[PDB]
Amino acid sequence: NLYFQHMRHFARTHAIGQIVPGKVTKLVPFGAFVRVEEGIEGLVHISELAERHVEVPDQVVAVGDDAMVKVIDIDLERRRISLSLKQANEDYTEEFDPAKYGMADSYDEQGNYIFPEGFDAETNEWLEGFEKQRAEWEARYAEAERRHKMHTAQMEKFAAA
Ligand SMILES: O=C(O)c1cnccn1
Ligand SMILES: O=C(O)c1cnccn1
C-alpha cells in the first residue's frame, strides 16, 4: 500500500501543530482539500476555514489559493490528514516561533532550545568539519522563516475584517 506508506512518512516528518504551506485543490460541501508542500492532500474541514461560521467554502478560499495551514490530526487508518486555517491564524504571532514552522525538534520537552550537533554554544560558532550539518540546519531554518513570512502575508491580507 503506497498511500499508507506516503501518509505515514508524512506523519513521521511533521509534528501535530506544525503549520505548513498548501495549495487549495478542491472545494466540497464539507470543506476544502489542500495539497501540502507539493506532496499530498489534507482536508480543511468547513468549520476550520475561519473563525466566523461559513455556509460554503468559497466564502473563504478558492481553488488555486496558497495558504498556510495547521496540521491538526493524522488518521492513518482512514488515511485523512486534517488541516485548519482558522487555528493556524489563532496561533500566529508576529514574533517568530520556529517550533511551529518545521523546527520543533530543536526544542525539548520543557521547550528549551537544543543547540544542534556541530554548533558551539560557548563559542557561538559552527565547528569546522561540520559543514554538512551547518548547511542542512541553515536550510531548515531558512524554510521555517519563509513559512512564517508567508503566514504574516496571510494575516496582513486579513484587511478583509
Ligand atoms: O465524503 C467524505 O469523505 C467526507 C464527508 N464529510 C466529512 C468528511 N469526509
Ligand atoms: O477521498 C479523499 O479523502 C480525497 C478526495 N479528494 C482529494 C484527496 N482526498
PDB file of all heavy atoms in Angstrom, residues 21-55:
ATOM      1  N   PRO A  21       2.753  25.235   4.365  1.00  0.00           N
ATOM      2  CA  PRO A  21       2.143  25.796   3.155  1.00  0.00           C
ATOM      3  C   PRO A  21       1.350  24.767   2.364  1.00  0.00           C
ATOM      4  O   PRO A  21       1.743  23.630   2.288  1.00  0.00           O
ATOM      5  CB  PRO A  21       3.347  26.175   2.298  1.00  0.00           C
ATOM      6  CG  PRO A  21       4.374  25.191   2.663  1.00  0.00           C
ATOM      7  CD  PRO A  21       4.169  24.894   4.145  1.00  0.00           C
ATOM      8  N   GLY A  22       0.301  25.220   1.701  1.00  0.00           N
ATOM      9  CA  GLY A  22      -0.535  24.345   0.904  1.00  0.00           C
ATOM     10  C   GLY A  22      -1.197  25.083  -0.205  1.00  0.00           C
ATOM     11  O   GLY A  22      -1.238  26.317  -0.213  1.00  0.00           O
ATOM     12  N   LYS A  23      -1.710  24.332  -1.165  1.00  0.00           N
ATOM     13  CA  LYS A  23      -2.429  24.906  -2.311  1.00  0.00           C
ATOM     14  C   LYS A  23      -3.791  24.276  -2.246  1.00  0.00           C
ATOM     15  O   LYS A  23      -3.891  23.066  -2.052  1.00  0.00           O
ATOM     16  CB  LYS A  23      -1.774  24.508  -3.588  1.00  0.00           C
ATOM     17  CG  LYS A  23      -2.128  25.343  -4.799  1.00  0.00           C
ATOM     18  CD  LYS A  23      -0.931  26.170  -5.227  1.00  0.00           C
ATOM     19  CE  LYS A  23      -1.046  26.651  -6.651  1.00  0.00           C
ATOM     20  NZ  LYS A  23      -0.351  27.957  -6.760  1.00  0.00           N
ATOM     21  N   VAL A  24      -4.845  25.084  -2.389  1.00  0.00           N
ATOM     22  CA  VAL A  24      -6.241  24.609  -2.339  1.00  0.00           C
ATOM     23  C   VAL A  24      -6.589  23.950  -3.668  1.00  0.00           C
ATOM     24  O   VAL A  24      -6.589  24.609  -4.699  1.00  0.00           O
ATOM     25  CB  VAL A  24      -7.247  25.770  -2.104  1.00  0.00           C
ATOM     26  CG1 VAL A  24      -8.670  25.330  -2.292  1.00  0.00           C
ATOM     27  CG2 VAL A  24      -7.098  26.347  -0.724  1.00  0.00           C
ATOM     28  N   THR A  25      -6.896  22.658  -3.627  1.00  0.00           N
ATOM     29  CA  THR A  25      -7.149  21.868  -4.858  1.00  0.00           C
ATOM     30  C   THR A  25      -8.607  21.618  -5.179  1.00  0.00           C
ATOM     31  O   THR A  25      -8.983  21.380  -6.307  1.00  0.00           O
ATOM     32  CB  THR A  25      -6.504  20.487  -4.769  1.00  0.00           C
ATOM     33  OG1 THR A  25      -7.034  19.766  -3.633  1.00  0.00           O
ATOM     34  CG2 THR A  25      -4.983  20.623  -4.649  1.00  0.00           C
ATOM     35  N   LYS A  26      -9.446  21.625  -4.174  1.00  0.00           N
ATOM     36  CA  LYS A  26     -10.797  21.227  -4.407  1.00  0.00           C
ATOM     37  C   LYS A  26     -11.672  21.673  -3.293  1.00  0.00           C
ATOM     38  O   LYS A  26     -11.323  21.557  -2.132  1.00  0.00           O
ATOM     39  CB  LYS A  26     -10.876  19.707  -4.506  1.00  0.00           C
ATOM     40  CG  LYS A  26     -12.006  19.251  -5.383  1.00  0.00           C
ATOM     41  CD  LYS A  26     -12.120  17.749  -5.435  1.00  0.00           C
ATOM     42  CE  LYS A  26     -13.327  17.344  -6.280  1.00  0.00           C
ATOM     43  NZ  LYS A  26     -14.324  16.528  -5.519  1.00  0.00           N
ATOM     44  N   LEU A  27     -12.861  22.101  -3.674  1.00  0.00           N
ATOM     45  CA  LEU A  27     -13.921  22.520  -2.783  1.00  0.00           C
ATOM     46  C   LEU A  27     -15.014  21.478  -2.672  1.00  0.00           C
ATOM     47  O   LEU A  27     -15.388  20.867  -3.652  1.00  0.00           O
ATOM     48  CB  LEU A  27     -14.510  23.793  -3.354  1.00  0.00           C
ATOM     49  CG  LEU A  27     -13.883  25.042  -2.771  1.00  0.00           C
ATOM     50  CD1 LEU A  27     -12.371  24.955  -2.662  1.00  0.00           C
ATOM     51  CD2 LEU A  27     -14.298  26.260  -3.569  1.00  0.00           C
ATOM     52  N   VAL A  28     -15.559  21.296  -1.483  1.00  0.00           N
ATOM     53  CA  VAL A  28     -16.657  20.383  -1.319  1.00  0.00           C
ATOM     54  C   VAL A  28     -17.608  20.936  -0.270  1.00  0.00           C
ATOM     55  O   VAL A  28     -17.276  21.862   0.468  1.00  0.00           O
ATOM     56  CB  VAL A  28     -16.180  18.984  -0.867  1.00  0.00           C
ATOM     57  CG1 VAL A  28     -15.369  18.299  -1.930  1.00  0.00           C
ATOM     58  CG2 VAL A  28     -15.355  19.089   0.405  1.00  0.00           C
ATOM     59  N   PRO A  29     -18.809  20.362  -0.189  1.00  0.00           N
ATOM     60  CA  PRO A  29     -19.731  20.915   0.784  1.00  0.00           C
ATOM     61  C   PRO A  29     -19.148  20.928   2.176  1.00  0.00           C
ATOM     62  O   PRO A  29     -19.428  21.822   2.924  1.00  0.00           O
ATOM     63  CB  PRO A  29     -20.917  19.968   0.706  1.00  0.00           C
ATOM     64  CG  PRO A  29     -20.840  19.415  -0.708  1.00  0.00           C
ATOM     65  CD  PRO A  29     -19.388  19.215  -0.918  1.00  0.00           C
ATOM     66  N   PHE A  30     -18.304  19.972   2.504  1.00  0.00           N
ATOM     67  CA  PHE A  30     -17.793  19.862   3.883  1.00  0.00           C
ATOM     68  C   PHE A  30     -16.385  20.435   4.122  1.00  0.00           C
ATOM     69  O   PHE A  30     -15.843  20.237   5.192  1.00  0.00           O
ATOM     70  CB  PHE A  30     -17.829  18.405   4.359  1.00  0.00           C
ATOM     71  CG  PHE A  30     -17.126  17.461   3.442  1.00  0.00           C
ATOM     72  CD1 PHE A  30     -15.807  17.112   3.664  1.00  0.00           C
ATOM     73  CD2 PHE A  30     -17.797  16.922   2.341  1.00  0.00           C
ATOM     74  CE1 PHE A  30     -15.158  16.238   2.811  1.00  0.00           C
ATOM     75  CE2 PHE A  30     -17.156  16.047   1.487  1.00  0.00           C
ATOM     76  CZ  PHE A  30     -15.831  15.710   1.712  1.00  0.00           C
ATOM     77  N   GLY A  31     -15.827  21.177   3.166  1.00  0.00           N
ATOM     78  CA  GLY A  31     -14.552  21.794   3.358  1.00  0.00           C
ATOM     79  C   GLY A  31     -13.746  22.013   2.096  1.00  0.00           C
ATOM     80  O   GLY A  31     -14.280  22.189   1.030  1.00  0.00           O
ATOM     81  N   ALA A  32     -12.437  21.979   2.234  1.00  0.00           N
ATOM     82  CA  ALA A  32     -11.556  22.257   1.139  1.00  0.00           C
ATOM     83  C   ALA A  32     -10.331  21.392   1.274  1.00  0.00           C
ATOM     84  O   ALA A  32      -9.704  21.327   2.356  1.00  0.00           O
ATOM     85  CB  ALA A  32     -11.127  23.705   1.166  1.00  0.00           C
ATOM     86  N   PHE A  33      -9.960  20.768   0.168  1.00  0.00           N
ATOM     87  CA  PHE A  33      -8.820  19.919   0.183  1.00  0.00           C
ATOM     88  C   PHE A  33      -7.675  20.755  -0.197  1.00  0.00           C
ATOM     89  O   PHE A  33      -7.799  21.619  -1.064  1.00  0.00           O
ATOM     90  CB  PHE A  33      -8.958  18.771  -0.796  1.00  0.00           C
ATOM     91  CG  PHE A  33      -9.808  17.652  -0.289  1.00  0.00           C
ATOM     92  CD1 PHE A  33     -11.145  17.571  -0.640  1.00  0.00           C
ATOM     93  CD2 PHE A  33      -9.269  16.682   0.541  1.00  0.00           C
ATOM     94  CE1 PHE A  33     -11.943  16.531  -0.171  1.00  0.00           C
ATOM     95  CE2 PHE A  33     -10.059  15.633   1.023  1.00  0.00           C
ATOM     96  CZ  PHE A  33     -11.416  15.561   0.656  1.00  0.00           C
ATOM     97  N   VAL A  34      -6.545  20.476   0.441  1.00  0.00           N
ATOM     98  CA  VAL A  34      -5.337  21.236   0.213  1.00  0.00           C
ATOM     99  C   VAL A  34      -4.124  20.341   0.017  1.00  0.00           C
ATOM    100  O   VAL A  34      -3.839  19.466   0.836  1.00  0.00           O
ATOM    101  CB  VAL A  34      -5.052  22.098   1.439  1.00  0.00           C
ATOM    102  CG1 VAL A  34      -3.804  22.936   1.225  1.00  0.00           C
ATOM    103  CG2 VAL A  34      -6.217  23.001   1.714  1.00  0.00           C
ATOM    104  N   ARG A  35      -3.385  20.600  -1.032  1.00  0.00           N
ATOM    105  CA  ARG A  35      -2.178  19.840  -1.299  1.00  0.00           C
ATOM    106  C   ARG A  35      -1.077  20.473  -0.488  1.00  0.00           C
ATOM    107  O   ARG A  35      -0.886  21.701  -0.530  1.00  0.00           O
ATOM    108  CB  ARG A  35      -1.819  19.892  -2.760  1.00  0.00           C
ATOM    109  CG  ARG A  35      -0.754  18.892  -3.188  1.00  0.00           C
ATOM    110  CD  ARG A  35      -0.253  19.133  -4.621  1.00  0.00           C
ATOM    111  NE  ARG A  35       0.447  20.419  -4.664  1.00  0.00           N
ATOM    112  CZ  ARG A  35       0.325  21.336  -5.614  1.00  0.00           C
ATOM    113  NH1 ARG A  35      -0.451  21.129  -6.677  1.00  0.00           N
ATOM    114  NH2 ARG A  35       1.008  22.479  -5.488  1.00  0.00           N
ATOM    115  N   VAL A  36      -0.372  19.631   0.255  1.00  0.00           N
ATOM    116  CA  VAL A  36       0.591  20.089   1.246  1.00  0.00           C
ATOM    117  C   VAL A  36       2.023  19.852   0.803  1.00  0.00           C
ATOM    118  O   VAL A  36       2.412  18.716   0.519  1.00  0.00           O
ATOM    119  CB  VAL A  36       0.383  19.371   2.581  1.00  0.00           C
ATOM    120  CG1 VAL A  36       1.596  19.587   3.464  1.00  0.00           C
ATOM    121  CG2 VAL A  36      -0.858  19.899   3.275  1.00  0.00           C
ATOM    122  N   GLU A  37       2.763  20.970   0.720  1.00  0.00           N
ATOM    123  CA  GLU A  37       4.194  21.036   0.332  1.00  0.00           C
ATOM    124  C   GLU A  37       4.480  20.437  -1.045  1.00  0.00           C
ATOM    125  O   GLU A  37       5.492  19.765  -1.215  1.00  0.00           O
ATOM    126  CB  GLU A  37       5.086  20.355   1.379  1.00  0.00           C
ATOM    127  CG  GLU A  37       5.189  21.073   2.713  1.00  0.00           C
ATOM    128  CD  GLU A  37       5.639  20.127   3.835  1.00  0.00           C
ATOM    129  OE1 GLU A  37       5.673  18.887   3.605  1.00  0.00           O
ATOM    130  OE2 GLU A  37       5.929  20.600   4.956  1.00  0.00           O
ATOM    131  N   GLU A  38       3.587  20.667  -2.013  1.00  0.00           N
ATOM    132  CA  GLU A  38       3.619  19.936  -3.316  1.00  0.00           C
ATOM    133  C   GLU A  38       3.603  18.385  -3.178  1.00  0.00           C
ATOM    134  O   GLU A  38       4.092  17.670  -4.037  1.00  0.00           O
ATOM    135  CB  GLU A  38       4.800  20.409  -4.147  1.00  0.00           C
ATOM    136  CG  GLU A  38       4.610  21.826  -4.665  1.00  0.00           C
ATOM    137  CD  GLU A  38       5.915  22.574  -4.824  1.00  0.00           C
ATOM    138  OE1 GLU A  38       6.822  22.069  -5.520  1.00  0.00           O
ATOM    139  OE2 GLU A  38       6.024  23.672  -4.248  1.00  0.00           O
ATOM    140  N   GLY A  39       2.993  17.888  -2.101  1.00  0.00           N
ATOM    141  CA  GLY A  39       3.100  16.500  -1.705  1.00  0.00           C
ATOM    142  C   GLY A  39       1.745  15.902  -1.848  1.00  0.00           C
ATOM    143  O   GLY A  39       1.273  15.731  -2.942  1.00  0.00           O
ATOM    144  N   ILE A  40       1.089  15.643  -0.723  1.00  0.00           N
ATOM    145  CA  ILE A  40      -0.255  15.046  -0.724  1.00  0.00           C
ATOM    146  C   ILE A  40      -1.284  15.933  -0.082  1.00  0.00           C
ATOM    147  O   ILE A  40      -0.969  17.032   0.385  1.00  0.00           O
ATOM    148  CB  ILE A  40      -0.302  13.677  -0.049  1.00  0.00           C
ATOM    149  CG1 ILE A  40       0.493  13.704   1.250  1.00  0.00           C
ATOM    150  CG2 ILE A  40       0.145  12.607  -1.057  1.00  0.00           C
ATOM    151  CD1 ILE A  40       0.782  12.309   1.771  1.00  0.00           C
ATOM    152  N   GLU A  41      -2.519  15.470  -0.083  1.00  0.00           N
ATOM    153  CA  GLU A  41      -3.633  16.332   0.242  1.00  0.00           C
ATOM    154  C   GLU A  41      -4.138  16.117   1.638  1.00  0.00           C
ATOM    155  O   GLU A  41      -4.237  14.994   2.070  1.00  0.00           O
ATOM    156  CB  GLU A  41      -4.761  16.143  -0.754  1.00  0.00           C
ATOM    157  CG  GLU A  41      -4.484  16.831  -2.076  1.00  0.00           C
ATOM    158  CD  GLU A  41      -5.526  16.534  -3.133  1.00  0.00           C
ATOM    159  OE1 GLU A  41      -5.749  15.333  -3.409  1.00  0.00           O
ATOM    160  OE2 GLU A  41      -6.126  17.501  -3.682  1.00  0.00           O
ATOM    161  N   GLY A  42      -4.480  17.210   2.331  1.00  0.00           N
ATOM    162  CA  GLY A  42      -5.274  17.090   3.543  1.00  0.00           C
ATOM    163  C   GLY A  42      -6.604  17.765   3.350  1.00  0.00           C
ATOM    164  O   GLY A  42      -6.836  18.457   2.375  1.00  0.00           O
ATOM    165  N   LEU A  43      -7.461  17.613   4.330  1.00  0.00           N
ATOM    166  CA  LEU A  43      -8.701  18.319   4.330  1.00  0.00           C
ATOM    167  C   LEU A  43      -8.786  19.456   5.372  1.00  0.00           C
ATOM    168  O   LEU A  43      -8.591  19.232   6.558  1.00  0.00           O
ATOM    169  CB  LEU A  43      -9.806  17.327   4.640  1.00  0.00           C
ATOM    170  CG  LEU A  43     -11.176  17.998   4.664  1.00  0.00           C
ATOM    171  CD1 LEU A  43     -11.557  18.554   3.300  1.00  0.00           C
ATOM    172  CD2 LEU A  43     -12.202  17.007   5.168  1.00  0.00           C
ATOM    173  N   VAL A  44      -9.146  20.663   4.936  1.00  0.00           N
ATOM    174  CA  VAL A  44      -9.592  21.685   5.876  1.00  0.00           C
ATOM    175  C   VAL A  44     -11.092  21.572   5.941  1.00  0.00           C
ATOM    176  O   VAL A  44     -11.817  21.982   5.035  1.00  0.00           O
ATOM    177  CB  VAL A  44      -9.264  23.102   5.465  1.00  0.00           C
ATOM    178  CG1 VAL A  44      -9.754  24.071   6.507  1.00  0.00           C
ATOM    179  CG2 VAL A  44      -7.768  23.287   5.266  1.00  0.00           C
ATOM    180  N   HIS A  45     -11.569  21.071   7.049  1.00  0.00           N
ATOM    181  CA  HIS A  45     -12.983  20.999   7.245  1.00  0.00           C
ATOM    182  C   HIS A  45     -13.602  22.379   7.197  1.00  0.00           C
ATOM    183  O   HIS A  45     -12.952  23.403   7.471  1.00  0.00           O
ATOM    184  CB  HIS A  45     -13.291  20.304   8.563  1.00  0.00           C
ATOM    185  CG  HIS A  45     -14.720  19.991   8.729  1.00  0.00           C
ATOM    186  ND1 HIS A  45     -15.589  20.836   9.390  1.00  0.00           N
ATOM    187  CD2 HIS A  45     -15.465  18.953   8.281  1.00  0.00           C
ATOM    188  CE1 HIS A  45     -16.810  20.326   9.363  1.00  0.00           C
ATOM    189  NE2 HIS A  45     -16.762  19.178   8.701  1.00  0.00           N
ATOM    190  N   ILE A  46     -14.859  22.432   6.817  1.00  0.00           N
ATOM    191  CA  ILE A  46     -15.520  23.720   6.633  1.00  0.00           C
ATOM    192  C   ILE A  46     -15.519  24.555   7.943  1.00  0.00           C
ATOM    193  O   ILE A  46     -15.305  25.754   7.917  1.00  0.00           O
ATOM    194  CB  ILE A  46     -16.946  23.528   6.067  1.00  0.00           C
ATOM    195  CG1 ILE A  46     -17.605  24.876   5.819  1.00  0.00           C
ATOM    196  CG2 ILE A  46     -17.826  22.695   6.993  1.00  0.00           C
ATOM    197  CD1 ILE A  46     -18.839  24.809   4.923  1.00  0.00           C
ATOM    198  N   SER A  47     -15.772  23.940   9.088  1.00  0.00           N
ATOM    199  CA  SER A  47     -15.734  24.655  10.388  1.00  0.00           C
ATOM    200  C   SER A  47     -14.326  25.197  10.737  1.00  0.00           C
ATOM    201  O   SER A  47     -14.210  26.061  11.569  1.00  0.00           O
ATOM    202  CB  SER A  47     -16.151  23.718  11.510  1.00  0.00           C
ATOM    203  OG  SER A  47     -15.144  22.688  11.652  1.00  0.00           O
ATOM    204  N   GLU A  48     -13.270  24.692  10.102  1.00  0.00           N
ATOM    205  CA  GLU A  48     -11.913  25.159  10.355  1.00  0.00           C
ATOM    206  C   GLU A  48     -11.344  26.144   9.313  1.00  0.00           C
ATOM    207  O   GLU A  48     -10.112  26.388   9.242  1.00  0.00           O
ATOM    208  CB  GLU A  48     -10.972  23.965  10.398  1.00  0.00           C
ATOM    209  CG  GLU A  48     -11.341  22.981  11.459  1.00  0.00           C
ATOM    210  CD  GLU A  48     -11.002  23.463  12.831  1.00  0.00           C
ATOM    211  OE1 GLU A  48     -10.071  24.334  12.989  1.00  0.00           O
ATOM    212  OE2 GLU A  48     -11.699  22.958  13.755  1.00  0.00           O
ATOM    213  N   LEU A  49     -12.213  26.696   8.504  1.00  0.00           N
ATOM    214  CA  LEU A  49     -11.781  27.628   7.491  1.00  0.00           C
ATOM    215  C   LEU A  49     -11.539  28.999   8.074  1.00  0.00           C
ATOM    216  O   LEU A  49     -10.607  29.700   7.667  1.00  0.00           O
ATOM    217  CB  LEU A  49     -12.820  27.741   6.379  1.00  0.00           C
ATOM    218  CG  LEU A  49     -12.796  26.574   5.378  1.00  0.00           C
ATOM    219  CD1 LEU A  49     -14.045  26.632   4.523  1.00  0.00           C
ATOM    220  CD2 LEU A  49     -11.534  26.532   4.511  1.00  0.00           C
ATOM    221  N   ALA A  50     -12.400  29.381   9.008  1.00  0.00           N
ATOM    222  CA  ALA A  50     -12.273  30.666   9.669  1.00  0.00           C
ATOM    223  C   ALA A  50     -13.027  30.685  10.988  1.00  0.00           C
ATOM    224  O   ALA A  50     -13.700  29.721  11.385  1.00  0.00           O
ATOM    225  CB  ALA A  50     -12.772  31.769   8.767  1.00  0.00           C
ATOM    226  N   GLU A  51     -12.844  31.785  11.689  1.00  0.00           N
ATOM    227  CA  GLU A  51     -13.466  31.967  12.970  1.00  0.00           C
ATOM    228  C   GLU A  51     -14.975  32.106  12.788  1.00  0.00           C
ATOM    229  O   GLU A  51     -15.753  31.451  13.478  1.00  0.00           O
ATOM    230  CB  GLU A  51     -12.831  33.180  13.664  1.00  0.00           C
ATOM    231  CG  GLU A  51     -12.776  33.055  15.173  1.00  0.00           C
ATOM    232  CD  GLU A  51     -11.811  31.989  15.642  1.00  0.00           C
ATOM    233  OE1 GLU A  51     -10.600  32.071  15.312  1.00  0.00           O
ATOM    234  OE2 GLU A  51     -12.278  31.095  16.389  1.00  0.00           O
ATOM    235  N   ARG A  52     -15.402  32.939  11.848  1.00  0.00           N
ATOM    236  CA  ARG A  52     -16.849  33.084  11.600  1.00  0.00           C
ATOM    237  C   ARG A  52     -17.447  31.787  11.066  1.00  0.00           C
ATOM    238  O   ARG A  52     -16.762  31.007  10.433  1.00  0.00           O
ATOM    239  CB  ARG A  52     -17.106  34.228  10.623  1.00  0.00           C
ATOM    240  CG  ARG A  52     -17.148  33.837   9.162  1.00  0.00           C
ATOM    241  CD  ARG A  52     -16.966  35.028   8.229  1.00  0.00           C
ATOM    242  NE  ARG A  52     -15.577  35.138   7.785  1.00  0.00           N
ATOM    243  CZ  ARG A  52     -15.164  35.091   6.522  1.00  0.00           C
ATOM    244  NH1 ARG A  52     -16.034  34.940   5.538  1.00  0.00           N
ATOM    245  NH2 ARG A  52     -13.858  35.194   6.236  1.00  0.00           N
ATOM    246  N   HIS A  53     -18.723  31.563  11.310  1.00  0.00           N
ATOM    247  CA  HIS A  53     -19.434  30.482  10.631  1.00  0.00           C
ATOM    248  C   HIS A  53     -19.510  30.729   9.101  1.00  0.00           C
ATOM    249  O   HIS A  53     -19.568  31.870   8.647  1.00  0.00           O
ATOM    250  CB  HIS A  53     -20.849  30.332  11.179  1.00  0.00           C
ATOM    251  CG  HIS A  53     -21.694  29.386  10.386  1.00  0.00           C
ATOM    252  ND1 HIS A  53     -21.800  28.045  10.699  1.00  0.00           N
ATOM    253  CD2 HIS A  53     -22.440  29.575   9.269  1.00  0.00           C
ATOM    254  CE1 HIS A  53     -22.601  27.456   9.830  1.00  0.00           C
ATOM    255  NE2 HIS A  53     -22.998  28.359   8.950  1.00  0.00           N
ATOM    256  N   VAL A  54     -19.546  29.642   8.326  1.00  0.00           N
ATOM    257  CA  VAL A  54     -19.471  29.701   6.875  1.00  0.00           C
ATOM    258  C   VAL A  54     -20.450  28.727   6.219  1.00  0.00           C
ATOM    259  O   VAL A  54     -20.536  27.552   6.606  1.00  0.00           O
ATOM    260  CB  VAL A  54     -18.039  29.365   6.432  1.00  0.00           C
ATOM    261  CG1 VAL A  54     -17.964  29.000   4.963  1.00  0.00           C
ATOM    262  CG2 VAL A  54     -17.134  30.544   6.715  1.00  0.00           C
ATOM    263  N   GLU A  55     -21.178  29.210   5.220  1.00  0.00           N
ATOM    264  CA  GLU A  55     -22.179  28.373   4.524  1.00  0.00           C
ATOM    265  C   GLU A  55     -21.554  27.561   3.392  1.00  0.00           C
ATOM    266  O   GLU A  55     -22.012  26.478   3.087  1.00  0.00           O
ATOM    267  CB  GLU A  55     -23.347  29.210   3.971  1.00  0.00           C
ATOM    268  CG  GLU A  55     -24.463  29.532   4.971  1.00  0.00           C
ATOM    269  CD  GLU A  55     -25.186  28.282   5.517  1.00  0.00           C
ATOM    270  OE1 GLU A  55     -26.020  27.687   4.830  1.00  0.00           O
ATOM    271  OE2 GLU A  55     -24.935  27.869   6.657  1.00  0.00           O
TER     272      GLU A  55
END
